[PDB]
Each structure stands twice: as structure tokens, then as C-alpha cells.
Amino acid sequence: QFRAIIESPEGAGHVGYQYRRNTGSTMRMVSDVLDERVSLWDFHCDPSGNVIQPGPNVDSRQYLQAAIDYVSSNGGGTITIPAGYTWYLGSYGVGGIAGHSGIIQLRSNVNLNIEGRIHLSPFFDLKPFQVFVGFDNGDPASSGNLENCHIYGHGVVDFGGYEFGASSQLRNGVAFGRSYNCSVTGITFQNGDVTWAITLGWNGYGSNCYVRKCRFINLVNSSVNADHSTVYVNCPYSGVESCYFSMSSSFARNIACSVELHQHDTFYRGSTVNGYCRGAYVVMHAAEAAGAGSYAYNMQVENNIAVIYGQFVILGSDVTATVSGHLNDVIVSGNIVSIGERAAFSAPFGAFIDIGPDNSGASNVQDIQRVLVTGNSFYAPANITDSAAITLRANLNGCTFIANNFDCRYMVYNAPGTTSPVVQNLVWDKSNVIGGTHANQRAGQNLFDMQFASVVNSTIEVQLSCEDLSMFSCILFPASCQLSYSKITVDSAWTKSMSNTAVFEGNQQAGANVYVSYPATVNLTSYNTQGAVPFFSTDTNYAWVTSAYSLSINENLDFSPPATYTNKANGQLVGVGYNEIGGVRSVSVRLMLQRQV
Amino acid sequence: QFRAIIESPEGAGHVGYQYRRNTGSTMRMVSDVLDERVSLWDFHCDPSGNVIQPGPNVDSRQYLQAAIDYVSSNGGGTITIPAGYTWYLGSYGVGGIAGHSGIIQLRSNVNLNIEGRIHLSPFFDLKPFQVFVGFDNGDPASSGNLENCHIYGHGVVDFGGYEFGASSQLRNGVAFGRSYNCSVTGITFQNGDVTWAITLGWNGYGSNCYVRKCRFINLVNSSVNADHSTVYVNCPYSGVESCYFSMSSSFARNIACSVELHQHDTFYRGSTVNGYCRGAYVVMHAAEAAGAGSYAYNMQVENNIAVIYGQFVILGSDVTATVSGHLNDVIVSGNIVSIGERAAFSAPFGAFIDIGPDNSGASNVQDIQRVLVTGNSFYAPANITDSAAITLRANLNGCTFIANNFDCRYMVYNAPGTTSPVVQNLVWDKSNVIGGTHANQRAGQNLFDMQFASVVNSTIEVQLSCEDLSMFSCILFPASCQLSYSKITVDSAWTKSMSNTAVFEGNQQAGANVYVSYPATVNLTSYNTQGAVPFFSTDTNYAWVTSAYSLSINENLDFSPPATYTNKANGQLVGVGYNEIGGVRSVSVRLMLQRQV
Amino acid sequence: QFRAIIESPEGAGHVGYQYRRNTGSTMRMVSDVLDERVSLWDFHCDPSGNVIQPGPNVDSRQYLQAAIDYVSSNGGGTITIPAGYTWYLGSYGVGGIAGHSGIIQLRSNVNLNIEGRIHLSPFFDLKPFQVFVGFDNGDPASSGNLENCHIYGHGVVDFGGYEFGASSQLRNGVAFGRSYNCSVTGITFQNGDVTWAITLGWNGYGSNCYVRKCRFINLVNSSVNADHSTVYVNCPYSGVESCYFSMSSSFARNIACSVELHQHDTFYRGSTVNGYCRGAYVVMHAAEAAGAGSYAYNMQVENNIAVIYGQFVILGSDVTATVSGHLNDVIVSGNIVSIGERAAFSAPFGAFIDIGPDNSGASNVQDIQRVLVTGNSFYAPANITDSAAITLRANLNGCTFIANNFDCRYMVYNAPGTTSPVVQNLVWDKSNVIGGTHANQRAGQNLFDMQFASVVNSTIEVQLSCEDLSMFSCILFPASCQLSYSKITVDSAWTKSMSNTAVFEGNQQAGANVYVSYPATVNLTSYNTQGAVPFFSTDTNYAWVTSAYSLSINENLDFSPPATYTNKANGQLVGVGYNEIGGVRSVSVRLMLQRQV
Ligand SMILES: CC(=O)N[C@@H]1[C@@H](O[C@H]2O[C@H](CO)[C@H](O[C@H]3O[C@H](CO[C@@H]4O[C@@H](C)[C@H](O)[C@@H](O)[C@H]4O)[C@@H](O)[C@H](O)[C@H]3O)[C@H](O[C@@H]3O[C@H](CO)[C@@H](O)[C@H](O)[C@H]3NC(C)=O)[C@H]2O)[C@H](O)[C@@H](CO[C@H]2O[C@H](CO)[C@@H](O)[C@H](O)[C@H]2O)O[C@H]1O
Ligand SMILES: CC(=O)N[C@@H]1[C@@H](O[C@H]2O[C@H](CO)[C@H](O[C@H]3O[C@H](CO[C@@H]4O[C@@H](C)[C@H](O)[C@@H](O)[C@H]4O)[C@@H](O)[C@H](O)[C@H]3O)[C@H](O[C@@H]3O[C@H](CO)[C@@H](O)[C@H](O)[C@H]3NC(C)=O)[C@H]2O)[C@H](O)[C@@H](CO[C@H]2O[C@H](CO)[C@@H](O)[C@H](O)[C@H]2O)O[C@H]1O
Ligand SMILES: CC(=O)N[C@@H]1[C@@H](O[C@H]2O[C@H](CO)[C@H](O[C@H]3O[C@H](CO[C@@H]4O[C@@H](C)[C@H](O)[C@@H](O)[C@H]4O)[C@@H](O)[C@H](O)[C@H]3O)[C@H](O[C@@H]3O[C@H](CO)[C@@H](O)[C@H](O)[C@H]3NC(C)=O)[C@H]2O)[C@H](O)[C@@H](CO[C@H]2O[C@H](CO)[C@@H](O)[C@H](O)[C@H]2O)O[C@H]1O
Ligand code: NA
Ligand code: NA
Ligand code: NA
Ligand code: NA
Ligand code: NA
Ligand code: NA
Ligand code: NA
Ligand code: NA
Ligand code: NA
Ligand code: NA
Ligand code: NA
Ligand code: NA
Prior knowledge:
Three copies of one chain form a homotrimer. By secondary structure, chain A is mainly beta. Chain A folds into three domains: about 1-80, Arc Repressor Mutant, subunit A (Helix non-globular); about 80-510, Pectate Lyase C-like, CATH 2.160.20.10; about 510-595, Beta Barrel (Elongation Factor Tu (Ef-tu), domain 3). In chain A, about 5% of the residues lie in helices and about 40% in strands. The first copy, chain A, contains four helices and 57 strands. In chain A, the strands form seven sheets. The first copy, chain A, has a twelve-stranded parallel β-sheet with strand order 5-8-12-16-20-23-26-30-33-36-39-43. A molecule of 6 linked components (NAG-GLA-GLC-RAM-NAG-GLC) binds next to strand 21, strand 24, strand 27 and strand 31 of chain A.
């Protein structure tokens, strides 16, 4: 009768054990010690309790769910998905996750240690799915929370390579739901056509959710795929750190973004991106303001490495009928980003920062301010016409650039004949270094092309570090752009031979509170008088000039033009030079024109 | 007789096992394999060896200690604190940790994998405690070391919500002691009223101690609590990375600091703080110099996100009778910090950097230098009068600010009628961007309020990015502040309408080695002479001016004032203008006054 | 007969188990559950299957290899190296790793959890070795890959303290080989004389290899050791993060480097270094271009803390007969670095950045560009003559410095009579702060010593923050250095008493596209005329000057020199001053000389 017990499933519960023969240790049974761990093998069995080998013809979903449900009932634990095996999923889950096209329901305090591989079976080909779902209701607004759920290990989630069947479908790897202290660490997500790999939170509900040391490889593969963002961070106090993102499909270059940060106190740091269209969206959607309020603040994008084809960071905020989204207190620092090799205009417009209009294309709903962009490097190959430090395409209430290195076609850009952004508090510090890769490519183009409705309380301190005589101007304001309470300067270095430096097509530099300086060539003529003698400009376009000074040597012995000039009411410049010998003098001089500076 | 063996505690030691039926594998017994792991269950038993269920009426302390002591005796290992259970602690420990109000003694090479919850029982209500202590003696100076002790997992240390019983009491979570290669990873510390959560090292003794991916939630809850700093780093080559700190109590806004760094080669990176008074102290206490010397150098505070109510980083050093503390080689970079919503003066003075007097209030003991503050963003709401980029309240031997974005009431501040710091090597680079949130709030106030005993070898390059005509001045030096061998400039942008820009109440700008430029309005009158004609200032307050130039347009046709001016011995300005027609001229002009620049 | 089965090695395979008595769980045997884990104990046995205790007289190599080989055959898993034991290695491995002096062969998907200690036995004294090798062939070009191999834990690899027997020998800890998704985490490598601790990849072959939270302690100890670099990163999309490196040997101060990055998309972040010669090499060796191409781009060195004796980051690229290496798109940011206490010239030349000639000493093979060095702090003690922000010793095609704090002897340096680098696109922004530690030490020395063949498209904006009248000049160009299309400025602050500020020994500032300004003292004399009167320089060395302005006060009542000056064809300066009373005037004035700026 003892033999029967020992060979029964209660057998281990009759074999005694004491840790290391320590007489001070608990007198236990072997089953107690084995019960301290749990794996999928403990649930991957047929109705008679016989273990089933996983494989492409076995659907492991019900067994994994049984494991999760059971461990949940004991207050949690960690289930191991064993190494050396591929565990296939081949059906949809039931109940609360069915509304989410869910496969597996995650549960609070039940962690998954994925050491083996989880593969999607062809049941999912051309269909929607979300592999792991933390919602417990079809309607997220009526869902309970997921808490203390961690997925980690050296294993792999493989989406089977299946294309989307229709653009309207959604696909996800891990949707944590209304998620508090949940995380994914170490996992490789690969070989799919999905909308997201991981979503965190739901419309501001959730906290302390993180993606760390994960890899995401080849997760877009078709023209059907409407849009892809690898990680969507939709709860506060959450972020993505030390991850690796790679795409190889041409479609990903037009549709894929690595991360989005959609709630306050979120971050994206220390990650490497290759083959994506975009780096990160940093936005406040009014529609997503329920859980954590209508402000996305304390947003951090730092120390990432990227090769992308479109825009690195996209800023935005928008409104609904009853809620207004605001984006403020953002830092973008220490990133090194390039636009990968491509033809001009062959992917979305290349940019380090984009101020993006809302999903309906509106440029007059945004409330974006207190952004710092500092200590980044950006590069686009010389052929890429559509490359800018910032594409400023919607209303901006402030963005500050200090000590970056931007090596691309444009510094500030917006297309003419499109949006007319209202710009406030745009600061471009003199410590921004403008690279020379695009020198000689800029025929017909303005380095800072200020195609806006208006600019106020802004600073543009242009500093070249090499010549580019191809450009039409360093900075141009069309007559349609109002300019007030602003500082616009062009340093003279490398500008001696430029026909135009700063261009104000509406004469906007004459504004009462516009502070400007830039180089210009000026023709002057003197009076005949021997001795101290006035020189006057021939042209009368300098009524706005407070002072000017020589940027040219004086090749003459018998006279010298003035070193410095002021203006007169008729718009001439005037200064006092010296005629060692008398005579009317005529000179053409390069001057630094100054207004209130 | 076999049956009896099998059911005995030696039973598992008689059941044979060979790994995966591999004939090349060791012929072992089941007990050998089970002996490869160890958990609290192996020691959580009564004197007859019967397992005891944990719970609020069970004190688990002796069992956990027995586990640690035993594993220590075998050269170490990792003890699991099982998931799905709350393990309560309800008594003090004995021996060497009793002097520290210790509960559990940590031991070298014995790691704790906390997957479940550790809770303090109400025995500890109103009492001191340190939950885990690595010292082995009541007197730390006679304590051995703790080495290779790691605490990690998804579990929780809960301090039971109990208030301090008296302000003089101390409470701690983990005190590693004289600690070498010790760490805490993943753990949540919550629900208390404590002095610290984690301390590392002891007075410079220790090395390579780290806190990573931990959460600290609601660890101050009473008015009795004297002071709280979540992590106190008191050994070199140690730090805090990727942690989350949150407080909700009003008291924490006045008393709580997230981290202190007190020894060389220490760091605080990539963390998020909410609801605290302070971010980090970075200090060298002479009293703590025994283990690692009297210099705190290589101190790093980077890439943190914070909402705080007082000061973000506090710098300091101090002395004892025989030892002098020095703080140097510090970097504060990439942080994004705001003062949270509060009334002016309702918490300690808001600051990004504070130069803090010693614990006795002395401002003349410090030796702080070679600090770099770069690429940070700081914001305080417009109502918060008590907000500064730096509150400079004690002697400073150097601090360098480059390429930050500071959006608060003051840039440099110290209160008048308090300390008179001696300031050396304060560098404020022109690349620091001054935000506009507090525009129009600054009536009676100086943006840079230089309330110091003296300033030497310093640079203040003031650059506005919007108008604020409410401020009394951009920078003011009271007559009591000596100023020498320094550069002080105010860029003209947004200053045209300011009555005062730079103010030197002791005429300190006249110093031999003071280099200054700022805008001013000057009245001039010319001689009557037709032709080249001198203009002279009516006032005689410009004996210090080396050159000046026009910041105003000339509304006249018949004459022009000089574009540039020098001075005369009587303190008038003088320049040569031009009278097309003769006559005495009188003008009021905005000039850039320059001295040696 | 049952008893015999139970005591046999198949015994555990006859004892039934069901998880937690769950009737829905798999009916398993105890051996199935034990088979879910594996340790070295399962293979550390004699030929009769009896377990062998590890120790200094036991060679564990064959047993560890048997474990790896076996687990490999089942598609992988994790082998534990148990805590509380030291496992000695005392022989070389056989087959494919013998060509690499290999001890253990790593295999794909077979992870090692090192909790105990692995020690080298004295068999290896004075011999070469590589402890863990991922190559499967003696010739790497014919080797298969290593994939999904992770080494982690709290354990230790100890190299036994043995010195190298000959300089030509190689020693390594982990050579992952042609390595894809491999990593080392948590491990301490200590007590050796080795070439490397860890190498990643092979000549560009490999991907996603990482070293995280590892310690490296005392890995150089002899004069025989030819060269040491702790981690050599030789595959793309790979890096080193949050590690600790320490050396105590004098030899390490001359030969040891913490990291090298040799392929694209690699990083070195968040680490602490003490006692090393060098921080990191960042290079493209043409010889290593097979796997990932001939460009090292997207290279990141950030947020490290270092005390070193030579150079922090060394940049380079080189060629073979058929391949040319290129280095571009590099960011060095947020690092805090000092040269440790040492005598001048007692270790390799101290530098933050070094542009290093190739291994044959050639300075004309490099293609280095698009480098950003920003937001770092560097310090060298005042006695260390051989300390520079950059030692620019080979051809440079671009490097940009913004918003750093450099406190050392030289800013830009190269030795005269050595290499004559061709320099292009060197940008030194005005936001770089120059510390004062070396003030008064610079007799005979130029702060920026431009000992190059030529300089083009470069910017040097010199800004002092304290006086140093000991220096010969702020910046000097020898006559042998061509200078064109460049901007060179010296801010006047702290320069009033300097005899020389900028020195152009070949009069190179006269170039058509050279833009310069610096202070100078100039003697002038006026004509006798009462009224507006010309002042002329006595010297004729200013044919290149476009304008000049006064940096001196005018101590006179009866006259004033000109505020501003231009030049004449004979090289005199000329300006119009004012004689209230007539008379020839003679003055010596400090002027800001300007050319095209
Ligand atoms: C793929 C992606 O992230 N694209 C973003 C875009 O996001 C929006 O489009 C999406 C397209 O997939 C998502 O849209 C769909 O999914 C919604 C959510 O699904 C339901 O709810 C979930 C919880 C459930 O499991 C499902 O079963 C569904 O029931 C659908 O409602 C919708 O019909 C789909 O088209 C995305 O929705 C969000 O998804 C996240 C993550 O799952 C959820 O947490 C949110 O609840 C949900 N949000 C809402 C409002 O429903 C859509 O948000 C972003 O809009 C843009 C951001 O950029 C654009 O706007 C900014 C700000 O104005 C501008 O600056 C830019 O210029 C402009 O382009 O970026 C895309 O990459
Ligand atoms: C809470 C906190 O960290 N506050 C710091 C403040 O720290 C000092 O006050 C503390 C208040 O709790 C600690 O003080 C007490 O604890 C001491 C240590 O306890 C004994 O020793 C330990 C090892 C043992 O386990 C215990 O059982 C006790 O026997 C007591 O001696 C003392 O009486 C208590 O009030 C703190 O002490 C240090 O604690 C750490 C961590 O445990 C130990 O490693 C150190 O050994 C110990 N140090 C000493 C000298 O004993 C006190 O240091 C800081 O002083 C300030 C820093 O800021 C201030 O100074 C700087 C520099 O001049 C200025 O710039 C600032 O302006 C100024 O405010 O910050 C507080 O937040
Ligand atoms: C120690 C170190 O890293 N020093 C670097 C230096 O590296 C070069 O010298 C090395 C000295 O140890 C290595 O040289 C030897 O090892 C080679 C590789 O060994 C064979 O192949 C391996 C795979 C196998 O396991 C072994 O059994 C051997 O069969 C030997 O071929 C050679 O004879 C030895 O001297 C190093 O080699 C590389 O090693 C890595 C890591 O193992 C491998 O992945 C590479 O395949 C291998 N590379 C090659 C080409 O074989 C040598 O590269 C660096 O050269 C310098 C960099 O700095 C210098 O150059 C730059 C760029 O021009 C300049 O800017 C600098 O100014 C200049 O100093 O730095 C040293 O610290
Ligand atoms: Na749905
Ligand atoms: Na997207
Ligand atoms: Na979008
Ligand atoms: Na308009
Ligand atoms: Na005590
Ligand atoms: Na405190
Ligand atoms: Na304090
Ligand atoms: Na004084
Ligand atoms: Na070899
Ligand atoms: Na080396
Ligand atoms: Na070398
Ligand atoms: Na030359």
C-alpha cells in the first residue's frame, strides 16, 4: 500500500526532506520543496493528467492560462516557460480579453519567466491579436487593474511572420492594461506585422510600468499595416530604457515609430533604433486625459542612438470638446541621430524635432512649451533636401535649443503654402553648431525658412562654421510673417561673400522691439572736404539701423571711411571718416548692420 | 524499515536521481538537488520541526535569522522569501545589531531574494528600528565588514504605517554597514515614517554598493519625523540608478530628500522623484572622512526627473577640529526639475542648486569647487517668489553653469541681512537660457541679486529671451559686495525699456579688473559747430567707460549723434557726430556702455 | 524490487508528484521537476557517477564542458555554478577552442548562472588562456556563430594572480566570438594579468552583445603585460553599461584602457573607472571591417566617471591595402574625468580627447569627422604639464566641442617637431569654460598651441574665466601652419595685462577668409589740429584690420582718442578723435582688433 502511495501523484508528499540534514530545519516533504516553483509543465497536460509535448500542432494557450489562473489564486508567483521548447499559441482567449482579441490574460502578482519561445500559430494569419492582455473587461473603462505583473527572461515572443489581413485591425504583444508596477525585461519580440509590441497603461491609468533590455526585431512587414509604434506608454511614472529596436522592411521606414510617451513623468533612454521612420512621439492627447490629467509634463528623451528615415522626436497636443491637452517640461538630450541613406522626399520629411499637427491636420489646437533640446547630434546625408533640425508645422508656445550639433539641409523649416504656425518663445542659442554636410546644396533655399503666421519672443542666433554660398539666405521671413519682440542675429563668420544674410521681406526688422544684426554690403559717398568728412549711404533703406560698423579693410592711403555709422531720418547711413587729401570718395563696404544690439 | 527511512526527514536522501536519465550525469539523491536552493520555509518551523504559517500573529524574525546564519556557515547562497505570503517581523534582533535597533542581521555572501512581502508588526509602533543591518557590532568602528550581500526581487518591505514616537528616534530599512559589493534591486519600500530606506557604507568604509530599480513610496507620514533621506550613500564607488521615489504627505514636502551622496565616485542617475522637499545632498562631512578621505570628488547627478518643493541639489562641505571636508569635481547634467504647485514661502526656498551652510548654520567653513551644472531644465510656477536657479548661501570656491534652461523667479539669489558668502569662480555662461514664466512678477526684485561679501574671478553673462519690465534690475551688487577680476554683461535684447539693467551700488564696475557691459540711457549735448562736432554727456558718471555705442535710431535729418563714444577725465562721455547744419543739439540716446570689453 | 528502483538513479522517476495537490495539474514524477533545472553538480562526477568535491586539486573543466555540451543538445538552458564553492580550472579545452588557448567552449542558448567562484589553477601560470570561448573553430573566419549565450550572477572569475610569461601572449576572460545576443551581467572579474576581460564579436561579426553591472578589479599586474583593454567591443549594436573598473598596479597607469568601441552603433555609458591609463578607444580599424563594413558610426561615450593617467577617449581610423576605415557620428557627453595625482610626464600625455596616429605611427591615414564633445568636465592637477582638452596628433576631418568645462594645462595641443596634422572643421565654441587650476604655471606655453600643417573651416572662440599672465599666448599659430576659412577670437575678459593674446607667426590672420578678433596694445599719435582730429598708429602692422575699438579709459580732459578705428593701405590704424584744445597727442591704448567680425 506504501508503494501505491509513492507511485501516485501524492507520492512526493510522503517522502521526507530536511534541508542539508540540518536538524534545526523544517521537517518537510519533497512535494513542499517542489511546490516552491511552478512551470508550464505543471499545467500542460491532457484531461487524464498526462503531459503533452508542445509543438506546431499543439495549442498551448489553455494550459498557460490554467497556470496563470491557478497561481493567481494563491496570491501570485512566477511561472517559468521552459527553455529548449517552443510553445505555440493557436486560439483566442475567452471572457474579458475577448474584446481585445486577447490570447492570454495576465493576472496580478503572476509573473512570467519566459526562457523558451512563444510562437503564434497560423490560426492568427491575417487576423487581429493581442498576445498578453492585462485588462479583465472588454470595456477598459470598466476593467479592474493589473498590478505587480512582470515578464522577463532570455526568451522570445515570435509573431509568426503573418501579415495583417486589413488595415483596420490591431495587433499587440503585451497590453498591460490599467497597469501598476508591471514590466517587461530581457525579452525578444520578433518576426511580425503588428501595431505595437508593448502598451503600458490605459488613458493615464497605471503607474511604474517599464520596458528594459528588450529587443524588437522586424515587427512590420506589409503594406496593409496602417501604423506601428513599438512601445506606447500610456500611464505616468513609466518608461523605456536600454532597448534595441530594428526594422528591415521598406514599409517600416514610412510607418514605424519606436516609442510614444503619452503621459507625465515618462522617459525613453539609452536605446538603439535602426530602420524606423520615427524615434518617439511625445504628446498629450486630450482623449487620453482621464487617468492622469490633461498635462504631459516631465517628459525625457535622452542618450539614444538612432538611424531613422523620418522624424526623431515629434511633439504635439490636442483637444476634444471638453478637454484640452497640454505638453510642457520636456527634455531631449544626449541623443545621436541620423537620417539613413535615402533619396530626397522618399520617406516622411527628415527632422530631429517635428511640431506635428493633430490627427485631423489642425495646427491651431496645440499647447506646447518649456521644451529643452540640448547636447544632441543630428546628421542627414547631403542629398536629403527634406532634412531639418526642426520642422515647425503647428502652433508652438516654446522650444529652447542649446548646444546641439545639427548637420542637415535646414535648421528651422516649415513648408510655404501649408500651415501658418503661430510661434512663441522659439530660442535658438548661438551655441548650436551648424554643420557643413549640405554646403553647396542649398540653391534657392533659406537655412532658417521662417514660414509662419507670426514669431514673438523668439531668439535666432545664426552661427555658421563653414561657407555655403549656394544658400539664398541664412534666415528669411516672408512678408506674411509678423515678427515682434525678438532677437535675430547672423554672425559675420563665413558670410563675407553672401549677397543675402538675413532677409525680411516685409521689412519686419524695423519693429520697435526687434533686435537684429546681420552683414550687408553698402555703397557710400563722401563730401569733398579735406579733414574729418561725412560718408553717406547712397541707398535710403536703413531708417531702422541704430549702428553699423566696418567688416572691410581700407585699401586707400589718402582717406579712410568711417569705422562706425549711425542713420538719418531719410534712411541713409552716416559716419565721420577722414580725408587726408580732399575729394569726393565712393566706396563699397561690408558692414555689420545693427538694430538695438 | 525502508518505508520508515522514506517517510523520515532523510527520505529524500535515499531516492536516487540522475539528471534527465543521462548516464554521464552524477548519480545523486533527490535531497542533493533540493539542497541546491533554500527558502524561509526551510527554517520557519517550531521546535519539533513542524512548519509554521506566517501571518500577523506570527513573528518570523528568528526563522529568517536562522536561515541567514545557516547559509552564512556554508559560504553563502540566496534565501528566497516566498511569493504569495506576508512575513511579519515582531521583535528586535540580538547581539551586534541591538545597538542599531536592528531586526535582522545580514551576513556576507548571503543574498535575499524577496518575492513575497515583509511587514512590520505593531510591536514597532512608536519605536525605532533598522530592519536589515549589516554591522556585526554595536559600535560601527569595531564592526567587521559586510561583503557580497544582495537583496533583490519583486517583493515588498512594508513599514506598517507606524509613526515615529519621538523625533530623536531613527528608522531604516536596509543598513548595509561597512559594506563592500552590496546591493538592493527591484524592491518596493513603502508605508512608513522612517529616517532612511537604505544606507550604504559607514563613514567612507565600503565600496561598490548600489540601489537599482527600487521604488520608495510614502515613507514619511508624521510631524514627529525629524528628517528623511531615502538613500544615504556613505561609501565610495556606489550609487543610485533607475529608482522611483514618491511621497504624498505634507510633511515630506518640508523634510524629505531622495538621495544623499557623501563620498567620492558616487552617483544618482535616471530616477524619478515626486512629492519630496529635496532631490539630493552632495556633501563632504568632515565627521565622515575616516574610511575614504576628506574629499568628495567625482559626484554625478544626472538624467533625473523631479517634482520637489524645496531644493534639487544641495552642495556643501564642513570641518571638525582635526579634519576639513572638501567637495570638488561634481557634475549635475540632464535633469528635468520643477517646483510643484505651492504658495510662495510655504516650503523651503525653491532652488535648482543650493550652496547650503553647515548644520550649525556656518557659511565660512565650505570648500566647494569645480562643479559643472549643464544641460538641465528647471521650472517654478509664476507665483513662487522663493525660486532660484542657485541660492548661494555659503562660501563658494567655484561653480560653472553652461547651457541650462532656468525658468523661475531668481537666477542667482541670496537673502540680504543673512549670510555674506565669499564667492569665487562663479561662472554663468551666456548659453544659460532665462525663461519668462515670472515676467511681470518681479516688482522690487533683482534677477541676479548678488548679496555677497565679495565676488572674484566670476562671470555673469545675462541674456534675456523676453521682456520683464517689472524687475528692478537684471543684476545688482550692493555696496557691501566687493567685486574684482570679474566679467558682468547684460545683452541688450529685451532691455530697451528698462530703467536699470546692471546696478553697482558701490560703483564697483570701476574696478581695474572688472570687465562689464550693459545698456543705459544717456543725455548728450553738442557744440554748435557745423560739420564734424562733439557730443558730450550731461552727466559725469562715466569715468569707468572705455567705449559706448548707440542702441537708438537717429530721427533727425540735419544732424547725427556719434555712433560711438569714449570718455573724458571728468566722467563725461564724448564722441564725434555730424551737424549738416550748425546748432547746439540735445538728444537722449540708449547706449551700450562698455568697460574693457 | 520496488526498493531497488527507488534507490537507483531512476528512483525519482518513480515517485509521483502533482503541483500543490491540484487535480488539474500534470501528473508528473519528481525527476521531471528536478530536470527543470541543472547545475554543475549534475556533471561534476567521476566515471562511476560519484560526485567529486571541487577544490584547488580538482580540475573542474571537463565537468563544466560536459554540462554545457549536454544542455546544448536539448536546445539550451541555464547551468548554475553553485554558490559556496570555488570551482578550479586546471587544463586547456580541446578542438575548436584550442587555437584560442581556450579553457571552456560556450554554446548557443546555454547560459551560465555563476553564483560561486571560478578560479584558475597554477597550471596557467606564465601561460596564455581565454577562459570562455564562443568560437567553434581555430580560425575565426571559418567559425560558426555563438547565439543567445548569457553569463550572469553574483559570482566571480578569478585569474589566480598569475603574471604573463611573455609579452606576445594573450589572455582573456570571455571571448564570445562571432556573437549574437550574448551578454555578461553582474560578474566580478579579478586578480590577474590579462589582455582583455571580455571581447564581443569578431571583426564586425555579431550583434546585440552587452556587458552590464560587472566589476573588473586588478587585471594588470606585471611589466610583461604588453597591453590591456578590459572590454573590446568588436560587433555592432553592442555596448558596456553601469560597470566598475579598478586597477592598482603602476603598470596599468601606462598600459590599461577600460573599453574599446570598434564597430558601429556601440556605446559605453554610466561606468566608473579608477587607476587606468585610458578610458576608451573609439576607432575603425580597416583590418576589422569584414562583418559590419568600414565605417564606425553611432558611437556613444556618456555619463562615465573616471580617474585615469593618460587619455580619456582616443579617436582614430586607419587603412589596409584594400579597405579604408572611417570614424564618424560620435558623441562624448556627460562624463566627469580627472587625471589622477602624478608627476608631469610620468605617464602617457594627459588628455580628454586624443586624435591618435595609427599603430605604425602614421598621422595621414585617418578619416575622423562629425564628432560632438559636449557637457563634460575634465580636470588635471596644476603640476601636470602634459594635460590637454585635446591632443590633436593626427589628421582630423572634424570635431565639435560645446559647453564643456576643461581645467588643465592646454586646451588644444600637439607637440612641435612631431606630426603635422591636417585639421578641418575643428569647432571650439565660446561656451567651453576654461578653468583656472593651471593659472601661473604656463610660462613659455600657448593655451591653444596650434602645431599643425594646416587649419581650415575651424572655429576657436577663446574665453578665459580668470587671469593667467604666465602664459605666452592664448593661441599661437606657427608660420608653418596654414590657416584659412576660419574664425579665431579671444574675448578681452582677463586679458588686459597680456603682452600677447593671439599670435600668428606667419601673419596668417591676414588671409582673405580668416575672421579674427583679439586685444592688443597700440601706440597712436594725433595731428595738432583743434577740433575733430585724426589719430594714427605709429606701427604699420594693421593692414589686415577691418575695425578696432577702445578697451581703455581716457584719462585726459583736453582731448579724447577715437572710440573706433579703421586702417589705411600702409598698415596704420586711423580714427577720428577730438582735441578740445589743439596739440599733437600721443597715447598708448588697449584695442580690440577685428578682422571681418
Ligand atoms: C499605432 C499608434 O500608436 N499610432 C499613433 C497614434 O495612435 C492612435 O492611433 C492608433 C492606431 O493604432 C491607436 O489607434 C487605435 O486603437 C485604439 C485603441 O484600441 C481600443 O482600445 C484598446 C484599449 C483595446 O485593447 C482595443 O481592443 C480597442 O478597443 C482604437 O480606439 C482606434 O480605433 C484604433 O485606430 C491609438 O489608440 C490608443 O492606443 C493605446 C495603446 O493601445 C491605448 O492605450 C489608448 O487608449 C488609445 N487611445 C485612444 C484615444 O483611443 C490612437 O491613439 C497617435 O494618435 C499618433 C500621435 O500623433 C499624432 O498626434 C499628435 C498629437 O496631436 C501630433 O503631434 C502628431 O503630428 C500626429 O501624427 O501617433 C501614431 O503613431
Ligand atoms: C536623515 C538625514 O540623512 N539627514 C541629513 C543629515 O544627516 C545627519 O543627520 C542624520 C539625522 O538622522 C543622521 O543623524 C543621526 O544618525 C547618526 C548615525 O547614527 C548612529 O550611527 C549609526 C551607524 C547607527 O546605526 C545608529 O544606531 C547610531 O548609532 C547619529 O549619530 C545622530 O545622532 C543622528 O541624529 C546622520 O548621520 C549619519 O547617518 C549615516 C546613515 O546612517 C551614517 O552612515 C553616518 O555614519 C552618520 N554620520 C555621522 C556624522 O554620524 C547625520 O549625518 C546631513 O547632515 C544633512 C546634510 O546637510 C547639511 O550639511 C551640509 C554639509 O555641510 C550642508 O551643505 C547643508 O546645508 C546642511 O543642511 O542632510 C540631512 O538631510
Ligand atoms: C589589447 C588591445 O585591445 N589593444 C588595442 C589594440 O588592439 C590590437 O592589439 C591587440 C593586442 O592584444 C590585439 O592584438 C592581438 O590579438 C590579435 C587577435 O588574436 C587572434 O585572433 C583572436 C580572435 C584569437 O582568439 C586569438 O587566438 C588570435 O588568433 C592577434 O592577431 C595579434 O597578433 C595580437 O597582437 C588586437 O586584435 C584584435 O583583438 C580583438 C579582440 O580579441 C579581435 O576581435 C580582433 O579580431 C583583433 N583584431 C585584429 C586586427 O586582428 C589588435 O587590434 C588596438 O589596435 C589599439 C587601437 O589604437 C591604435 O589604433 C587607433 C586606430 O588607428 C589609433 O587611433 C590609436 O592611436 C592607436 O594606438 O588599442 C589597443 O589598446
Ligand atoms: Na476592444
Ligand atoms: Na506609429
Ligand atoms: Na502619427
Ligand atoms: Na501673419
Ligand atoms: Na547605535
Ligand atoms: Na533629509
Ligand atoms: Na539638511
Ligand atoms: Na564685503
Ligand atoms: Na588563435
Ligand atoms: Na589597451
Ligand atoms: Na593603443
Ligand atoms: Na604647413
